[PDB]
Amino acid sequence: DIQMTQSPSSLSASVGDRVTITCSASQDISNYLNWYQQKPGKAPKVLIYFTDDLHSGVPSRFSGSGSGTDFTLTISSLQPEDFATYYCQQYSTVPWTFGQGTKVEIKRTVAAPSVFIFPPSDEQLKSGTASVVCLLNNFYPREAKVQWKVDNALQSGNSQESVTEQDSKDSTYSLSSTLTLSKADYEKHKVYACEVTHQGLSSPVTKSFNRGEC
Amino acid sequence: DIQMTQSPSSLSASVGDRVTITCSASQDISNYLNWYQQKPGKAPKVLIYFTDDLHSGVPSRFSGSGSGTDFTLTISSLQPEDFATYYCQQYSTVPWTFGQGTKVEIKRTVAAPSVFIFPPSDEQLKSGTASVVCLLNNFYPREAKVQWKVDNALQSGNSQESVTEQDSKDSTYSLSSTLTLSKADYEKHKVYACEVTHQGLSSPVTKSFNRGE
Amino acid sequence: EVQLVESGGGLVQPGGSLRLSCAASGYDFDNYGMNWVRQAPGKGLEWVGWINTYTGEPTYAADFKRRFTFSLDTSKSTAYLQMNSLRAEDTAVYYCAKYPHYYGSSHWYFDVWGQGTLVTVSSASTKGPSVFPLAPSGTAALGCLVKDYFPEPVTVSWNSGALTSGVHTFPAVLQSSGLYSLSSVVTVPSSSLGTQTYICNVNHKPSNTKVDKKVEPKSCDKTH
Amino acid sequence: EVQLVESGGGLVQPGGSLRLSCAASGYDFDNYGMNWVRQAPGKGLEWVGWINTYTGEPTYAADFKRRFTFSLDTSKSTAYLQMNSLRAEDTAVYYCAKYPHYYGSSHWYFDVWGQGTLVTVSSASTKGPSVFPLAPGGTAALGCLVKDYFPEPVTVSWNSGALTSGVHTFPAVLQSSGLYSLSSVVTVPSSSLGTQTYICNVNHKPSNTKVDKKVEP
Amino acid sequence: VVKFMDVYQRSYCHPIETLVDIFQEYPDEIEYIFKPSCVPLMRCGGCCNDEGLECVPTEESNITMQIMRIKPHQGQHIGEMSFLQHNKCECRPK
Amino acid sequence: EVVKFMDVYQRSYCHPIETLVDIFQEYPDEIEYIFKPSCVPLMRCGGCCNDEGLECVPTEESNITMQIMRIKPHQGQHIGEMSFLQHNKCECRPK
């Protein structure tokens, strides 16, 4: 088995920047090397084959070069929709083998999250559990902090977060934080808050509601 | 040029006889030899090619053999219509050459001629000549003697003869003798006769006529 | 159009076996080799091998030779990948990908892929989700909470695909109960909350659960 | 039916020239080689040469290269033999003859022959014959005398060809005058000399003679 | 452009019209020029599903053709000559 | 039946005929592939000339494109387009 090493493993660049990704083979493979782009939730898509042949339908800002054991994929002007993992593939000897991947993130201007909070539904409260959800919409960069407070008491251990993939048009992220309580603990307390800390906010933003009031 | 030589040059045989004709070539011609038959007044007709291949339509009583420089044509049962001259022909090298020919006559039983005499026609005499014609019809053998007598004087040097070829069904000959005289000499005599002598007549036969009757 | 549609993914117990199928359409199945490629959750790509669709002859990467089997049904233009003695490390999305038309020389890249089908090596049972409204309280946020299902995946659409901009469907998080939970939210103009209807469409195929939850603003009996 | 019909013969003067023709019918003229053969009167046969009817390529026996020419008109399916500087030893009947269909291997025999045309090399003039009658249960003889013609040949028939049994047409004889003469006779039943007309048809083409003489009692 | 299936079907082992040199088929006929010097015969040709197999006749018949023979300087005539045709072909190993 | 002389000669005279040509011979540099089919039907000059000094050669030529399956064993299998030389007109010329 020929081993393909890619570097870097991830990189961050602005829209318009020239991006370059290298592939290294454990032994000479001639020009028998392809490149693929894989966007979140989709099968990989061939960009270039035979080192430098642009596949039909692929923007000309993708190009390849190299030979022997060294290969380069170039993106001459990085576009928001080039968020993806990029893989190289040799076909000099079976089995065909791939490099480990390069994650390309887009760098953009700071954007603050829009924050919303959702009380548990009534239908869920029957079943004996209550979920409180905090949503952080369309922000940059990825690092954010969410803290829950119930009647001003900081929670810990009873929440889980989930972050979307970088958006392919505006380069932002969204995040959801879910706080889980039994139906008993949820009615013992009145005021529910999430406090959001993010580079785009000068000071933390808080969203809250009182049990039973719109 | 390859010289082909046949033998014999002529021969007589009876109906039923086996007849044999040979052909010698001045040099080896392998088997490239054909045989033709030629009947009076006709083109030759191929009998046999390639030494011994019989041409279609040719009776099977004909056959050939030989090789190199010696070759043979056999008629295993001579028929009256086999009267003809037979020629061989080599096609080993150009030019194609032929033998001289072998005449085949049929022998048969003696038959006496029927004799007829014809006075000159009134037409001919109009123009000043007299031809007297004597016909010997369907006889055998070919040898015959015709003497002309005018008022009993034996004639000499004023007659010519013609003989037909042997008939192909009955093997007979016919002959004509013509006596030619001026109209003036013709009219100075009374009795015109031709006397025929032939093996099939024990005494000469005389046919005659009298001028102007 | 050239499409590869896979199917057969699902739950299978450690040490068990199943058959994956890759139905081709929109070209002559017999004229291009069919490749199998797998990707474990969050990981790289792994070439399993390929099969000659004209003759039927398979060729396996070494690590896959003992437990993975290729086969064909040319009348139904379908390629199969059968697997047994399965282990946790075989949990992955399995792709079929066809070789390309050549023009000059032959180049063995993967031209058209299937959508992929997910194999999960687990003993846990199938459990369908509960769907709860995230009610809206200017741009308004609303959504629905898809809670307590197994295994992945769930699909969520809004108004049957009519509504696509402003949608975020967060990746599932695994709870301590071993069940998945996810949210799907959409931001919408605050003045459309009266007129415009918002239904969310949840499909959990592993359990034949399809839910449509209409989400609209909650009327409350107190207001702060 | 395959036939070759020749023409062009007759008188030609010593040192002169003439052209014979051989018109072919009943087969594809181009597919078979054409031969020329000649026979001097009362003598043997002599091959002159042959011509390839597909290409036109001639081949002459050596003794004939200098005075004989072969040629083709393939659209008329005719072969020609042209002769010049003629001598008396060229007097002969000239035949054409086609080669055969082959079966297996090639044997060069002559398959179908023309009827032959006599060429007479002589500076003498033609002379047309006069035709006299030889006037006549038993059998009667009758005929006609074809006197004083040149050159050969003359043909005689009886009742336009309806009467052939018992006809004898004698070889011509050359008279001291240099002219030919012959007799044709037939024997018939005497009883028919009343109910039956006997015409002798005499033909001498070199003088354009065509006579029908009735022979009666 | 010729499509794969059609190229494959037209090129597979079968009797195809083939111009055969007459002397090659009749090497005893040594002194002749033949017109025409070749004849069109149905003979096996084309390819097999893999390099180990070769295309070969399994059923044969004869065809009779009129051919002109010329021995230069000697003569010229036509006649019938018989030739071997292939009616059925099979792929078999070499 | 019997084929008549004039018929045989017209049908055998110098002209383009369908000829099965081995793909590897027209492309001696493709040693690493198996082709299917391994030969293609192409128009090429065939038949005879009017004498032994002449040979049937092309005087006009063109190209035709056919789909050929390439297989490299163990690696891959696919169809694609290959170009082949055809003869459109033939003449008899001296050797």
Q: Give the per-residue SS3 of A84-131.
A: EEEEEEECCCCCCEECCCEEEEEECCCECCEEEEECCCHHHHHCCEEE
- Give the other-Cβ count within 10 Å of C105's Cβ: 11
For residue C96, what are the β-bridge partners?
Answer: C36
Is residue A141 reached through a cis peptide bond, with omega within 30 degrees of 0 on the bond before it?
yes
Q: How big, in percent rounded to 5, are the helix, strand and coil portions of chain D?
A: 10, 50, 40
**CB pairs below 8 Å between B and D: how many?**
109
Residue C180 backbone dihedrals phi, psi, to 5 degrees: -85, 160
Last residue of a domain, one of D80, D100, D123: D123
The alpha carbons of chain A give a radius of gyration, in whole angstroms, of 23
Chain A residues with CB inside 8 Å of F74's CB?
Answer: 94
Cβ-in-10-Å burial (0-12, 13-18, 19+) of C13 comes to exposed
Q: How many secondary structure helices (H) and strands (E) does chain C include?
A: 0, 19
Chain F residues with CB inside 8 Å of C101's CB?
Answer: 78-80
Chain F residues with CB inside 8 Å of C31's CB?
Answer: 69, 78-79
Spatial separation of the C-alpha atoms in residues F17 and F47, rounded to whole Å? 8
User: In this complex, do F11 and E49 lie within 8 Å of one another by their Cβ atoms?
Assistant: no
Q: How many secondary structure helices (H) and strands (E) does chain F include?
A: 2, 6
Give, for F26, the enclosing helix (H) or strand (E). helix F23-26
Of residues D93, B45, D89, the one with CA closest to residue D81: D93
Last residue of a domain, one of D101, D123, D145: D123
Are both C54 and C24 inside the same structural domain? Answer: yes
Is the distance from CB of B11 to CB of B24 less than 8 angstroms? no
Q: Name the 3-class secondary structure at C165.
A: coil
Resolution in A: 2.5
Residue C155 backbone dihedrals phi, psi, to 5 degrees: -105, 145
Chains B and A touch (3+ CB pairs under 8 A): no
Is the distance from CB of C114 to CB of C89 less than 8 angstroms? no
Contact partners, residue B19, CB within 8 Å, separation at least 6:
B11, B13, B74, B75, B78, B82, B104
Spatial separation of the C-alpha atoms in residues A133 and E37, rounded to whole Å? 96
**CB pairs below 8 Å between B and E: how many?**
3
Q: Domains in chain C: how many in total?
A: 2
- Read off the CATH number of the domain in which D206 is found: 2.60.40.10
- Give the other-Cβ count within 10 Å of C17's Cβ: 13
- Give the other-Cβ count within 10 Å of B59's Cβ: 13
**C117 within some domain:** yes
Is residue E36 reached through a cis peptide bond, with omega within 30 degrees of 0 on the bond before it?
yes
Q: Which residue has the tokens 């199998």?
A: C36
Which residues of F, range 58-77, sit inside 8 Å of A by Cβ? 74-75
Spatial separation of the C-alpha atoms in residues A179 and A191, rounded to whole Å? 14
Q: In this structure, what DSSP letter does residue B77 have?
A: S
Chain breaks in chain D (C to N over 2.5 A) after: 136
Are both D35 and D133 inside the same structural domain? Answer: no
Are both C147 and C67 inside the same structural domain? Answer: no
Chain F residues with CB inside 8 Å of C106's CB?
Answer: 33, 70, 72, 75-76, 78, 80
D58 and E CB contact within 8 Å: no
Chain B: partners with 3+ C-beta pairs within 8 Å: D, E
Dig out the tokens for E65 from the structure. 């053709």
How remote is the C-alpha of C111 from its chain's centroid? 20
- Length of chain E equals 94
Are both C157 and C91 inside the same structural domain? Answer: no
Are both D64 and D5 inside the same structural domain? Answer: yes
**C224 within some domain:** no
CATH of the domain spanning A1-108: 2.60.40.10
Spatial separation of the C-alpha atoms in residues D13 and E10, rounded to whole Å? 73
Dig out the tokens for C74 from the structure. 């040319």
Dig out the tokens for A42 from the structure. 């989709």
Is the distance from CB of B200 to CB of B140 less than 8 angstroms? yes
Chain C: partners with 3+ C-beta pairs within 8 Å: A, E, F
The string of DSSP letters for B13-58 reads EETT--EEEEEEESS--TT-EEEEEE-TTS--EEEEETTTEEPTTS
**CB pairs below 8 Å between D and E: how many?**
42
Q: How open is the CA angle A114-A115-A121, to the nearest 5 degrees?
A: 135
User: In this complex, do E40 and F1 lie within 8 Å of one another by their Cβ atoms?
Assistant: no
Q: Name the 3-class secondary structure at C90.
A: helix
Q: Name the 3-class secondary structure at C61.
A: coil
Q: How open is the CA angle E81-E85-E89, to the nearest 5 degrees?
A: 170
C190 and F CB contact within 8 Å: no
Of residues B163, B155, B157, B158, the one with CA closest to residue B195: B155
Which residues of chain C form beta strands (DSSP E)? Answer: 3-7, 10-12, 18-25, 34-39, 45-51, 58-60, 68-73, 78-83, 92-98, 112-113, 117-121, 130-134, 139-149, 155-158, 167-169, 173-174, 180-189, 199-204, 209-214
Q: Name the 3-class secondary structure at A185.
A: helix
Is the distance from CB of C173 to CB of C130 less than 8 angstroms? no
Spatial separation of the C-alpha atoms in residues A131 and C6, rounded to whole Å? 36
Using CA atoms, how far residue D175 sits from B162, D11, D203, in Å, is 12, 19, 20
How remote is the C-alpha of A18 from its chain's centroid? 21
Spatial separation of the C-alpha atoms in residues A61 and C40, rounded to whole Å? 30
Is residue D153 reached through a cis peptide bond, with omega within 30 degrees of 0 on the bond before it?
yes
Q: Name the 3-class secondary structure at E5.
A: helix
User: F74 CA to chain A: closest CA distance, Å?
Assistant: 8
Dig out the tokens for A6 from the structure. 């890619």
Spatial separation of the C-alpha atoms in residues B45 and D112, rounded to whole Å? 8
Using CA atoms, how far residue B112 sits from A51, A70, B137, in Å, is 121, 129, 9
Determine the residue of chain F that is closest to E19 in CA distance. F47
Determine the residue of chain F that is closest to C30 in CA distance. F78
Is the distance from CB of D91 to CB of D121 less than 8 angstroms? yes
Are both C84 and C161 inside the same structural domain? Answer: no
Are both D132 and D184 inside the same structural domain? Answer: yes
Are both C7 and C54 inside the same structural domain? Answer: yes
Dig out the tokens for C152 from the structure. 């992945």
Are both D61 and D79 inside the same structural domain? Answer: yes
Are both C87 and C190 inside the same structural domain? Answer: no
Chains F and C touch (3+ CB pairs under 8 A): yes
Say if residue B138 carries a ligand binding annotation: yes
Cβ-in-10-Å burial (0-12, 13-18, 19+) of C97 comes to buried
Is the distance from CB of C163 to CB of C144 less than 8 angstroms? no
Determine the residue of chain C that is closest to E49 in CA distance. C55
Contact partners, residue D109, CB within 8 Å, separation at least 6:
B34, B46, B49, B55, B89, B91, D99, D100
CATH fit for domain A109-211, picks 3.40.605.10, 2.30.110.10, 3.90.105.10, 2.60.40.10: 2.60.40.10
Long-range Cβ contact pairs of C207-212 (< 8 A, separation 24 or more)? C207/C126, C207/C127, C207/C128, C207/C149, C208/C128, C209/C128, C209/C129, C209/C149, C211/C129, C211/C131
Spatial separation of the C-alpha atoms in residues A18 and A62, rounded to whole Å? 10
Is the distance from CB of C8 to CB of C21 less than 8 angstroms? yes
D164 and B CB contact within 8 Å: no
Give, for D93, the enclosing helix (H) or strand (E). strand D92-98
Last residue of a domain, one of D99, D123, D147: D123
Which residues of D, range 143-162, sit inside 8 Å of B by Cβ? 143, 145, 147
Are both D107 and D159 inside the same structural domain? Answer: no
Is the distance from CB of D68 to CB of D59 less than 8 angstroms? no
Q: Which residue has the tokens 């004709």?
A: B21
User: In this complex, do A98 and C47 lie within 8 Å of one another by their Cβ atoms?
Assistant: yes
- Length of chain D equals 217
Q: How open is the CA angle D210-D215-D217, to the nearest 5 degrees?
A: 170
Q: How was this structure determined?
A: X-ray
Query: Which of B46, B101, B123 faces D132 most closely, judged by CB atoms?
Result: B123
What is the domain range of residue D38? 1-123
Spatial separation of the C-alpha atoms in residues C102 and E27, rounded to whole Å? 49
Are both C93 and C167 inside the same structural domain? Answer: no
Contact partners, residue B210, CB within 8 Å, separation at least 6:
B190, B191, B192
What structural domains does chain E harbor?
Answer: 1-94 (2.10.90.10)
- Per-residue exposure over B86-121, b if at least 16 CB sit within 10 Å of its own CB, e if not: bbbbbbbebbbbbbbbbebbbebeebbbbbbbbbbb
User: In this complex, do E11 and F41 lie within 8 Å of one another by their Cβ atoms?
Assistant: yes
Spatial separation of the C-alpha atoms in residues C47 and C64, rounded to whole Å? 9
